[PDB]
Structure formats: C-alpha cells, structure tokens
Amino acid sequence: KETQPIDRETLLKEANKIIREHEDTLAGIEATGVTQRNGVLVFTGDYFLDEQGLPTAKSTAVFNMFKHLAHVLSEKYHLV
C-alpha cells in the first residue's frame, strides 16, 4: 500500500521509458473483434499474454489502447 519516494529527474526518465515501450508494442496491436455488452463497446485482440495466460508488461499497452477505443467509439457509434 505504501509507495516509494522518487525525484523529478528519475520519474521522468521512467515515464519516458514507458512511452517508448508503448510505442514499440503499438506496432503489433490490432483490434480483431468487438461486441456491445450493454451500450459499451468491448474490443478484443491479442493481449500478448504469457504462456500461462497472464498479462505481461507488453499487455498493458493493449488494455490501455482497447479501453481508449471503447471510451471514444462508444460515444459515437452503436453496433448493429
């Protein structure tokens, strides 16, 4: 529950490492399925899960992007 202290310079360095990671992963991200579960779009695709089926560092970018798609596209479209 407790967090670690960090300074501005070190935090920005790690933040920028995350951005570069996301940029890398995004080249492989593709929505391959969508349903509308109750007025909410849910996009599906390859989450880059590990061999045991668990999310990886790489998966985080997929969850973020698919949530963004649901959030934005659900406001303008309904699936027929």
Query: Can you tell me the distance from the alpha carbon of 20 to that of 61, in angstroms, rounded to the nearest whole number?
Result: 11
**Residue length of the chain:** 80
Any contact of residue 39 with Cl ion (CB under 5 A)?
no
Rg (C-alpha) for the chain, rounded Å, is 16
Least distance from a second copy to the Cβ atom of residue 49, Å? 18
Least distance from Cl ion to the Cβ atom of residue 39, Å? 13
Any contact of residue 59 with Na ion (CB under 5 A)?
no
Any contact of residue 74 with Na ion (CB under 5 A)?
yes
> Phi and psi dihedrals of 36, rounded to 5?
-115, 105
Least distance from a second copy to the Cβ atom of residue 54, Å? 17
